[PDB]
Design a protein around this ligand. Structure first.
Ligand SMILES: O=[N+]([O-])c1ccc(O[C@@H]2O[C@H](CO)[C@@H](O)[C@H](O)[C@H]2O)cc1
Ligand SMILES: O=[N+]([O-])c1ccc(O[C@@H]2O[C@H](CO)[C@@H](O)[C@H](O)[C@H]2O)cc1
Length: 445
């Protein structure tokens, strides 16, 4: 009774432009908000930057050959706005566009389907200098970028994601000051959450317009399974407030043309710069919803978080090196909520994986039994999802290989493939050799 997935199921791995590329000055690429952010003392746990990362710019062919070994039929990557429009708007940089053409051409000729994320956090600094995410002019700036690169590649690229993890882009970048540009203000975060949604909305008909009937496009939300520490009244209020903050702040606008009522009031409705016609734009029909899932979050009333007044409770169980609770059930539940609340015609897991302190054995091998366990569990939760009649068409592991993990630097390795930063050597981990059996059996033995 082998648990096998639908025939045309998309098995993938996922990267982002700044996390893998390096060659940060190469071929007229301009500094991104992250290139400048990495300079800030205490911003990156290990004091590193994305200047070299995985050197995937000069080494993409090797990586595609490793992907062919992994046996995937799809690859999720982000395009770097800094390479395509270095000045933010205006002159297209052909050298920049040249790279993504060589990358997509290399992918298609190995029969790997490209999934192009338009924006994975790496705005050109010169552009941010004019239109931060909290300034409404960003919407036009993003759409122009989208138009350029979707004109160049939509012949060869059918699947487009608009923006990766609005909640991250807005709260981590402007809310908690933990990501580029690293500002920390309730209003700034909300304006940014709203202009990200608006930007996703206006970019949709520009993607379809540059494509054909075969063109498919959607947003990427990160969603956590939220849980109340107790069935008490003001704890269920903390969980509900935190669920609305993370999950429902982006979902509700996208499908029901509205922010959650309780949290919108809690904040002050005036802080959110909603102009007339915005909800028409944000609700623009999409082909799929893409989902990043990592962990469960159990919540009580408290003051750890000044803004939401919540504390986090850690239930007894399995934790990754990231201090993220391992809870595959969470993935089945998130998919099922989305299925029943919003009825998206397709779902994708565009990112799921786990960081563990890897070690190269004397044999030059990487034995990561804990990552292997993590992925099996979530693959299982994804299989149980399909058997309930949830239209999950694909699954991309985060990540193909160890990379720049943002504020945690190179210390947190997510790859099913090890990278020795000393030599740039790729070693397929045990979890990778196993993933190679899964993709080719199109299921779990
Ligand atoms: O899917 N996402 O975007 C996501 C990923 C990892 C997350 O991390 C969780 O967050 C909580 C608050 O920090 C922790 O208390 C909890 O133990 C951890 O599992 C939470 C959410
Ligand atoms: O605050 N959180 O819960 C959170 C933070 C960053 C997140 O990041 C996601 O997952 C990976 C790291 O977790 C990234 O490497 C990747 O760029 C992104 O899609 C996802 C969630």
């Amino acid at each position: 009774e082998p648990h096998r997935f639908p025939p045309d199921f998309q098995w993938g791995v996922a990267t982002s432009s700044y996390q893998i590329e390096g060659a940060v000055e190469a071929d007229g690429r301009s500094p991104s908000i992250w290139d400048t952010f990495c300079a800030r003392p205490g911003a990156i746990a290990d004091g590193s930057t994305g200047a070299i990362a995985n050197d995937h710019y000069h080494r993409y062919r090797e990586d595609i050959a490793i992907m062919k070994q992994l046996g995937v039929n799809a690859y999720r990557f982000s395009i770097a706005w800094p390479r395509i429009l270095p000045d933010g708007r205006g002159r297209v940089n052909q050298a920049g566009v040249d790279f993504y053409e060589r990358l997509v051409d290399s992918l298609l000729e190995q029969g790997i389907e490209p999934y192009a994320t338009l924006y994975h956090w790496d705005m050109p600094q010169v552009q941010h200098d004019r239109t931060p995410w909290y300034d409404r002019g960003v919407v036009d700036a993003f759409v122009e970028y989208t138009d350029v690169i979707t004109r160049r590649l939509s012949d060869r690229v059918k699947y487009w994601m608009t923006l990766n993890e609005p909640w991250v882009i807005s709260f981590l970048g402007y809310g908690a000051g933990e990501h580029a540009p690293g500002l920390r203000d309730k209003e700034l975060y909300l304006r940014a959450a709203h202009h990200v949604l608006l930007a996703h909305g206006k970019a949709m008909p520009v993607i379809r317009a540059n494509g054909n009937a075969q063109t498919k496009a959607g947003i990427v939300l990160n969603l956590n399974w939220v849980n109340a520490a107790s069935d008490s009244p003001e704890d269920q209020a903390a969980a509900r407030r935190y669920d609305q903050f993370f999950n429902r702040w982006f979902a509700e606008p996208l499908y029901n043309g509205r922010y959650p009522e309780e949290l919108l009031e809690w904040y002050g409705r005036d802080l959110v710069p909603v102009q007339p016609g915005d909800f028409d734009i944000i609700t623009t029909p999409t082909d799929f919803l893409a989902v990043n899932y990592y962990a469960r979050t159990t919540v009580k009333a408290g003051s750890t978080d000044p803004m939401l007044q919540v504390d986090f409770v850690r239930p007894p169980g399995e934790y990754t090196a990231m201090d993220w609770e391992v809870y595959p059930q969470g993935l089945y539940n998130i998919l099922n909520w989305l299925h029943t609340d919003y009825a998206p015609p397709a779902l994708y897991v565009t990112a799921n994986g786990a960081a563990y302190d890897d070690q190269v054995s004397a044999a030059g091998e990487v034995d990561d039994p804990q990552r292997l366990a993590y992925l099996e569990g979530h693959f299982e939760a994804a299989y149980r999802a399909i058997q309930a009649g949830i239209p999950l068409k694909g699954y991309f592991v985060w990540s193909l290989m160890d990379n720049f993990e943002w504020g945690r630097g190179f210390e947190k390795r997510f790859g099913i493939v090890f990278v020795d930063y000393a030599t740039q050597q790729r070693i397929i981990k045990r979890s990778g050799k196993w993933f190679s059996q899964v993709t080719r059996a199109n299921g779990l033995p």
